[PDB]
Amino acid sequence: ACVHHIKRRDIVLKWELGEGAFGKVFLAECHNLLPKMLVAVKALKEASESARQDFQREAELLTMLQHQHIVRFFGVCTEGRPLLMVFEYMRHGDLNRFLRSHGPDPGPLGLGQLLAVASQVAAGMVYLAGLHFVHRDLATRNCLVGQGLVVKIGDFGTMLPIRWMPPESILYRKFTTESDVWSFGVVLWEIFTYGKQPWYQLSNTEAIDCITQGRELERPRACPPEVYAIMRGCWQREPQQRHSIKDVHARLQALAQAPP
Amino acid sequence: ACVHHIKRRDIVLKWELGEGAFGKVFLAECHNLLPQDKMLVAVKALKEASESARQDFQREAELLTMLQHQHIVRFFGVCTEGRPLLMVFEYMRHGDLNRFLRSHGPDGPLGLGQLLAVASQVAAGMVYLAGLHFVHRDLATRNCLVGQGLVVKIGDFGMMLPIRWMPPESILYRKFTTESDVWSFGVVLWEIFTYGKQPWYQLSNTEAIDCITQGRELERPRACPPEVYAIMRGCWQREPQQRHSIKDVHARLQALAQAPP
Amino acid sequence: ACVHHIKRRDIVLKWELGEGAFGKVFLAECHNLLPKMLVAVKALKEASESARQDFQREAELLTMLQHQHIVRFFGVCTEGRPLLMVFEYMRHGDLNRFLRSHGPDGPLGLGQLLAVASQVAAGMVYLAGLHFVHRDLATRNCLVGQGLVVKIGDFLPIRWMPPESILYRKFTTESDVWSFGVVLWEIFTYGKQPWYQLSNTEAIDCITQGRELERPRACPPEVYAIMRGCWQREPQQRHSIKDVHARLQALAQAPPVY
Amino acid sequence: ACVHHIKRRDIVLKWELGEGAFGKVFLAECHNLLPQDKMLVAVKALKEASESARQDFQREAELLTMLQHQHIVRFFGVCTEGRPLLMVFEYMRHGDLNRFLRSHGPDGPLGLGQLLAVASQVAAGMVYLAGLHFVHRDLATRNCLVGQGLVVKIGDFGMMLPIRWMPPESILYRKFTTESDVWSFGVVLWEIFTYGKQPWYQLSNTEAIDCITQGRELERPRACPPEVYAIMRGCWQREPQQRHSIKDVHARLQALAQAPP
Amino acid sequence: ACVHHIKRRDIVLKWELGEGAFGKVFLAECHNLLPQDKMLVAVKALKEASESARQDFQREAELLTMLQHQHIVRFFGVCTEGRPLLMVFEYMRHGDLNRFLRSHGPDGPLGLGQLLAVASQVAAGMVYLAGLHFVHRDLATRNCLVGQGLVVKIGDFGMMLPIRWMPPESILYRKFTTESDVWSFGVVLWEIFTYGKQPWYQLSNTEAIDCITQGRELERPRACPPEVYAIMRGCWQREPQQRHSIKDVHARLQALAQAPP
Amino acid sequence: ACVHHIKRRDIVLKWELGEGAFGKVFLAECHNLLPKMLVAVKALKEASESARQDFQREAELLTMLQHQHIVRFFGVCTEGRPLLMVFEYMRHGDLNRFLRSHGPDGPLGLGQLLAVASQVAAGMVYLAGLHFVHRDLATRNCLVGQGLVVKIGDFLPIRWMPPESILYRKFTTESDVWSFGVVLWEIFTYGKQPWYQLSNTEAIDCITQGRELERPRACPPEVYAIMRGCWQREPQQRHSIKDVHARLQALAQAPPVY
Amino acid sequence: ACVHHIKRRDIVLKWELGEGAFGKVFLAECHNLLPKMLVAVKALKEASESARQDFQREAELLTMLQHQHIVRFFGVCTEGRPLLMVFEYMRHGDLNRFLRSHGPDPGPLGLGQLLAVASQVAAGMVYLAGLHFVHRDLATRNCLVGQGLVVKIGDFGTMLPIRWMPPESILYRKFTTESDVWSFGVVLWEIFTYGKQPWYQLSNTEAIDCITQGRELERPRACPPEVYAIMRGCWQREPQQRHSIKDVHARLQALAQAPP
Ligand SMILES: CC(C)Oc1cc(Nc2nc(N[C@@H](C)c3ccc(F)cn3)ncc2Cl)[nH]n1
Ligand SMILES: CC(C)Oc1cc(Nc2nc(N[C@@H](C)c3ccc(F)cn3)ncc2Cl)[nH]n1
Ligand SMILES: CC(C)Oc1cc(Nc2nc(N[C@@H](C)c3ccc(F)cn3)ncc2Cl)[nH]n1
Ligand SMILES: CC(C)Oc1cc(Nc2nc(N[C@@H](C)c3ccc(F)cn3)ncc2Cl)[nH]n1
Ligand SMILES: CC(C)Oc1cc(Nc2nc(N[C@@H](C)c3ccc(F)cn3)ncc2Cl)[nH]n1
Ligand SMILES: CC(C)Oc1cc(Nc2nc(N[C@@H](C)c3ccc(F)cn3)ncc2Cl)[nH]n1
Ligand SMILES: CC(C)Oc1cc(Nc2nc(N[C@@H](C)c3ccc(F)cn3)ncc2Cl)[nH]n1
Ligand SMILES: [Zn+2]
Ligand SMILES: [Zn+2]
Ligand SMILES: [Zn+2]
Ligand SMILES: [Zn+2]
Ligand SMILES: [Zn+2]
Ligand SMILES: [Zn+2]
Ligand SMILES: [Zn+2]
Ligand SMILES: [Zn+2]
Ligand SMILES: [Zn+2]
Ligand SMILES: [Zn+2]
Ligand SMILES: [Zn+2]
Ligand SMILES: [Zn+2]
Ligand SMILES: [Zn+2]
Numbered sequence A, G: 001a002c003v004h005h006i007k008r009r010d011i012v013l014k015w016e017l018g019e020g021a022f023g024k025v026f027l028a029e030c031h032n033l034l035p036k037m038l039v040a041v042k043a044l045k046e047a048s049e050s051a052r053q054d055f056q057r058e059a060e061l062l063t064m065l066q067h068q069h070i071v072r073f074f075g076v077c078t079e080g081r082p083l084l085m086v087f088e089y090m091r092h093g094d095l096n097r098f099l100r101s102h103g104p105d106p107g108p109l110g111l112g113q114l115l116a117v118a119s120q121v122a123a124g125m126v127y128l129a130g131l132h133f134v135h136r137d138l139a140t141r142n143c144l145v146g147q148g149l150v151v152k153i154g155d156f157g158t159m160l161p162i163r164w165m166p167p168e169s170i171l172y173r174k175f176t177t178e179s180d181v182w183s184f185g186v187v188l189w190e191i192f193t194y195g196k197q198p199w200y201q202l203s204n205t206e207a208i209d210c211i212t213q214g215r216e217l218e219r220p221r222a223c224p225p226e227v228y229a230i231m232r233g234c235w236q237r238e239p240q241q242r243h244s245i246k247d248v249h250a251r252l253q254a255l256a257q258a259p260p
Numbered sequence B, D, E: 001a002c003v004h005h006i007k008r009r010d011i012v013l014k015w016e017l018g019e020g021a022f023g024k025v026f027l028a029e030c031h032n033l034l035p036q037d038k039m040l041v042a043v044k045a046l047k048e049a050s051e052s053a054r055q056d057f058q059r060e061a062e063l064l065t066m067l068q069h070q071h072i073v074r075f076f077g078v079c080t081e082g083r084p085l086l087m088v089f090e091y092m093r094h095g096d097l098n099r100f101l102r103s104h105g106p107d108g109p110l111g112l113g114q115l116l117a118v119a120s121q122v123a124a125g126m127v128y129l130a131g132l133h134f135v136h137r138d139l140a141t142r143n144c145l146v147g148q149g150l151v152v153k154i155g156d157f158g159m160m161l162p163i164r165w166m167p168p169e170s171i172l173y174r175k176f177t178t179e180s181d182v183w184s185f186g187v188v189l190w191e192i193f194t195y196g197k198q199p200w201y202q203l204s205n206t207e208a209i210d211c212i213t214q215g216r217e218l219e220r221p222r223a224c225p226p227e228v229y230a231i232m233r234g235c236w237q238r239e240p241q242q243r244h245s246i247k248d249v250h251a252r253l254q255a256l257a258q259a260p261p
Numbered sequence C, F: 001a002c003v004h005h006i007k008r009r010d011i012v013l014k015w016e017l018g019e020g021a022f023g024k025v026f027l028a029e030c031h032n033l034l035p036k037m038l039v040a041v042k043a044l045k046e047a048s049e050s051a052r053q054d055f056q057r058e059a060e061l062l063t064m065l066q067h068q069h070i071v072r073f074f075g076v077c078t079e080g081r082p083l084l085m086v087f088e089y090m091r092h093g094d095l096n097r098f099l100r101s102h103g104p105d106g107p108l109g110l111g112q113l114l115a116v117a118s119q120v121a122a123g124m125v126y127l128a129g130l131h132f133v134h135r136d137l138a139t140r141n142c143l144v145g146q147g148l149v150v151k152i153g154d155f156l157p158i159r160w161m162p163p164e165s166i167l168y169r170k171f172t173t174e175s176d177v178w179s180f181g182v183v184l185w186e187i188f189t190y191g192k193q194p195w196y197q198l199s200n201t202e203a204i205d206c207i208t209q210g211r212e213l214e215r216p217r218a219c220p221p222e223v224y225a226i227m228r229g230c231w232q233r234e235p236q237q238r239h240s241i242k243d244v245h246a247r248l249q250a251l252a253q254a255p256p257v258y
């Protein structure tokens, strides 16, 4: 087997963890995978041939990716139904639902914790940029939280995440590394607002207006100005002026070791 | 193999355990399935040889292989290359729960601590299902099985409407959810405590449907304490959102099983 | 397996090394390939069928071609997307970029320059002995590894082409020596583009009207005699690659130093 | 596998040994083919990727795997799944017999005991063929190979007419038999003793065909004793039934090889 | 041809008459369809190009070609080789009956002799259907059309449940018959006399379904004589066997149309 | 035959009229098409299958669309290469080139300019009444025939696009009026490119920030009121094409003259 | 039938007229074609599917072409063997064989006759250029001669006519309208030399040398300088400086009415 295959008979389902557009994610016990262990099992609903292709293709890419801050892929089973993709279990779920339930609405995550969360997401994004891979949908809803506040990028995939997109992506549909930094800036903003929807008051069309008009999201209260500088560096009008995710990660890593 | 395949040459049929719409269930010996040689198993043998049926059977197998719980019937494997199509499960010697209830009732019958253990056990199976967001759609005692030690498990997944066990929202607005399954479980509790009596037995399908649709609840069984009948009643709320959680229903039943009134 | 298969699952991408027309090359870690190690992964963008069979055939040839100065082919996977070809990792990148970096814009000495040249020529002798015509020999298509190891890394580049290939479209092992001559020039000019002053058109006129490239500042006359030997107008009058390599190897070990 | 398959990953090409119409022959190393690791082999690499050609190549391989004789080139295996199509044989370092003869002649040359051993060796190969009722149809020194120790073997099976080596019955009445092969062997003897000279070299194809058709025999070579030229003459009878048996031809040559005139 | 085919080159689109789920309806000119050259027609142009949809469309055409009645919309032909799929019908200039009723009401409106002629005309169409044992399943004024001369015809055949127009047996026990169609016609009579008001407009789908299921009838409209409301009531019996025959319903309405109260 | 077929043999090419992305348009003589005549032949370069079925469908629509101000579709041949679509010949070419030619670089008068505009609007009323959204209405896509007959000739042109189509990708009959407004401007500026001073990017910023195009020198205020009516930011607040056409037709017959 | 079909049964073959690469051209009698007549029948040898396609495609193009100086196409029959294409009969054969047998090697064609031949070929070429169609192989071997010195373009179709090609076609394989004028210039030269091979002394490689070197063919003896001016206008180095075939035709037409 070329991509790793996980036998259905080795997967015992425990309970549902959550729902995506694609279908369902369960907690499972997986027997004989590393020398029983808990795993997350993504199970596809669609069952068609177009979707079965995309699923295989995703498994094909993901077997080759491997990083401390990308969710660990274990294998696939595409012969049979539902189509299964198995990953490491991150018990605290998605980063957006986590921020919202660990903020003011132990107490809220402290500044240093927020900077650790930001730094981990950024680290994942340096791996992707270095691979010349464009995510296109970086958002806190697409990140996962493990025990002990380990955070990893959890998902890689017309519907558009318009509030996270820069002007040039809204207008010209150009997705690059530098549009991913833009989205990262908005991720920073989500982190420091404890999971708020960017431009939440506004409707989608009003959000587009603001983004296209050059209007920046406000500095969150929990957000020190040096972090807001980082946001603004992600939010330059011209893509080539925008900071590298590498610079962005370094700056946050430095900030997280000796916080202001 | 991805799903466990059971070789026909490893099965010897003993006698028929029962019949269904799908075909037949036999008691069989199975050679080298688990690490002694021979062991007794139940073999679901499919009537139709249709390619559509052969698919569904394949689909069913690749669901059940991933399920596993103390209160769901254990699935061992399948063979779909040949006739009849075979699915192998653990042998539950006392057969289906409905016929069992009717057999160990006033027509010694089953005590309270016993009838409670039976209901607790079904509920456990149903917590597993609800936790998976799996909707059963046909929970009834005819679809549960009883093994040695009064072990009881969910035995069938349905696969024509069981209108009497259905709540108003499933009949009228055609909605099947995890809370339509707690309803049916309520009707299952009623089955257990009436020793397998059909719900609304005097009534026909045309009038049962009217009865439930207007909010007429089932009468309390003789053998049934009113704390128990409360659990049934919590399952029978008109509005789905009001109904009890199977987790809670099960917690109560597991409680009453330790301290029986 | 007939061609060696690299299981997708034994690959972990590290980062992109460079881009081609074919797609992308990545640095990866490879799990149990020889009795963890670093490899170069060629990932094809095309995904079609013309290109998918073309990739298989390329792998079927490369599997049998081994030489100390041809980049090592480890294996393939065409069962999946993207199509993968895995090679040895040559840490210093293409030889043109390397020449530009280690040039006067600390420079490599005569003996290093001659080692580079000797290695490219060794790869070219293997090819000519197989009767394989390269057609696109240029420093951009060679790779540099640890220790100044240099190998041929890739298989109209008019500036490297002789008159018969421009005019009459004849490609032979003797047109390959011509190109090697031009490669020698690139090495000794620290990676300069041949005929850089002129444009894509006025260069072909220069090649056609018998004009030879200037002797580079860093180039001993005995090396220029090698180039000039590659650059005879008559294909059969051109020096054999085998004699060119012999000479360059001798001079790399025992140089003229100025 | 039925025919031995040689994995591409076990072949490393060294350099081209020569060209044919089929494609190319290379010297290669072969890893684990016979019980040491590496050994030198010759690799016939096919130009055409046609499905008809791919079949013929497959057909050729499944003949040659069954052949084996000291004086037929040893076939090791094939690979037909991939491009180019590969057939692997033993390496004969001195190449084809014609170019060898021309190289070790007056243009020290080859002695009599040597030239006889060469002819004896070809004949041995041809006895094997006649004993199998296999008709070669294109025996000529260009189709034999020479290895270390002056070992000589049949190297090619033909696979456009070699009119000069053909007898009148093959030209006129188009008949190819085991006795048209002894004819050609006679012309091969003439090749050996002229050190690789083309038969009827001054003549063109149009007139060679006339020459043989009217019964004009080839002239005796300088280096050739008349007992030897007798053997050639026995091969050149107008009537096939009159011609010598390759077994006898070989017996004579093996005799003269021990006691050279 | 078996079904009349209308060549695309004979249709010129004028403007869109309306939209449906299927796609769009246009007013078009049609050249040489009936023995003058040009005539106005309605063209149903299908959105989906699916092969399953293309079949259904073909199936629909080969039913409608056999139907013909003064009070069913006249079908002229089809073209299914090309996109979009086309079905051609007679042009009914005043559009659907619901929007017409709303337009010629208190929000001069329509008299009694008029509203009666409208209901008589629908009923006539429905007698034809019942006589063929054809069950409509979705009779409503939105599915009737109005042409010049206040001519009204059934315009659509349905092709998601119109729960408000459905009787209890169709909701509960899922039974569609000719008598579930007289029910719906009763609700159509109510539509006509309320000038196109939605039945149970204050109520939502969840509660309408409860309302009809328990036997709550619709209120008598202002413009509606009680002899007329009797006809509606005859259509609304709980038991299908008790309901009036559309033939009788139509006879009454044709009677009242001559002698209006 | 369901769609009208033009037999290849009834066509004789005269010369090329122009080029598109689709391929080429030729002037041809057509033999027995209506009870010899000149036609425009659209010959498709693509020849594939995606494009070959696309061409058939285009013909299947066009066959049913007839209007005095939509270029007349005569027939098709997809049985052969190249794929052919035959239309009426509009001798004066595209309306943009025509406006540039007959402009101050003898000029058309107010009444002629208004006739041109009225004709384009008439074509747009037919389309909007069919609920057909054009998406690319510009003078380059209209044709001029003998007698100043003007018709719509073809089915991101950001400069003709309204804010909702740039920003939110919404294309409606009300975005088509917006484009018609811009067409009015082109007519009255004798074929000038809207926002010609600015570039492809600074124009979209101008559209987005509510900036209207300047009233052309040749443009009476009552015509500018028409444009401005097409150029309301709110789609539902924009004038209907039917009212725009009524007005322009009235003004073409009874102009303000200055 | 979309392209005109000629029934085999209406074609009676008379004798072979000549040979192409494609096969044979016969003289035939064709019954019921215009209201018996002689026609030339091109018959394909190859018989494959690749070639049967190209044949259909050629017939598809040629049914739409029609000009006084392009050979008249009548129809095709592709169902059956050989594949047949029928054209008008031009009884004097190809223009090259005609020049060679009507020159010094009535007497030779006079200047005015040579200018009529040139003008007719040019006229054919104005039609092609106006259609934006590139011939790629204009040569006298590809023209036909009818009774009364009517001359038409006879053929429209790696092997390269290198002596007729300009540098930019030799080097870059760019074939345009302006490379067709180049070839026309060489056609003029063939006409005024009574059918001589351009660069006949030289080999193909030597011809390429001369063309690439910028060396022009010499003025033929039968050629007045005003005609040689026309040749030179076809032979400019830069394609955009080269004269239009329209100008070239006018100049020759003027020269043929009032010859110098
Ligand atoms: C890539 C996924 C299958 O790996 C996961 C997910 C979890 N745990 C949880 N996942 C979810 N929701 C899923 C749909 C999800 C997946 C990816 C993502 F970025 C966000 N959300 N909800 C709760 C948990 Cl505990 N472990 N491994
Ligand atoms: C899932 C089944 C095949 O596993 C079983 C059945 C038994 N024992 C018996 N089963 C039956 N009737 C069968 C048709 C049945 C299956 C499922 C169910 F929920 C109820 N009834 N009759 C008698 C016996 Cl002893 N063991 N394992
Ligand atoms: C044949 C290739 C896959 O083997 C390689 C490449 C490297 N390292 C690098 N390669 C490149 N650029 C690639 C596109 C390349 C490949 C071949 C070639 F001749 C020139 N350039 N850039 C940087 C590095 Cl470090 N190792 N093995
Ligand atoms: C059957 C062949 C592949 O086995 C061989 C050939 C050699 N060595 C050489 N072969 C040749 N020419 C080849 C084409 C050849 C093959 C057969 C034959 F009868 C004559 N020539 N040229 C040089 C050498 Cl060294 N070894 N084994
Ligand atoms: C069966 C139809 C195509 O025949 C028609 C429709 C009309 N006129 C109009 N139709 C509509 N809406 C269409 C969608 C419709 C069709 C059937 C139906 F029962 C109700 N509505 N809107 C306006 C008009 Cl004028 N004539 N013939
Ligand atoms: C729809 C076309 C085939 O109908 C035409 C075109 C003409 N005449 C001319 N067309 C053109 N350019 C073509 C590409 C064109 C087509 C449509 C369009 F809207 C604009 N341009 N150029 C000159 C002429 Cl004379 N008649 N009929
Ligand atoms: C296009 C052709 C079939 O039309 C022709 C040819 C003739 N007459 C003659 N053709 C030939 N040779 C043929 C091969 C030929 C065809 C075209 C061309 F440009 C040159 N040569 N030889 C003698 C005659 Cl009489 N009539 N119609
Ligand atoms: Zn599997
Ligand atoms: Zn890249
Ligand atoms: Zn089996
Ligand atoms: Zn769920
Ligand atoms: Zn693989
Ligand atoms: Zn070779
Ligand atoms: Zn192989
Ligand atoms: Zn025999
Ligand atoms: Zn049709
Ligand atoms: Zn019936
Ligand atoms: Zn046609
Ligand atoms: Zn619409
Ligand atoms: Zn025919």
Ligand SMILES: [Zn+2]
Residues within 6 Å of the ligand: F016, F018, F019, F024, G131, G132
């Ligand atoms: Zn063109």
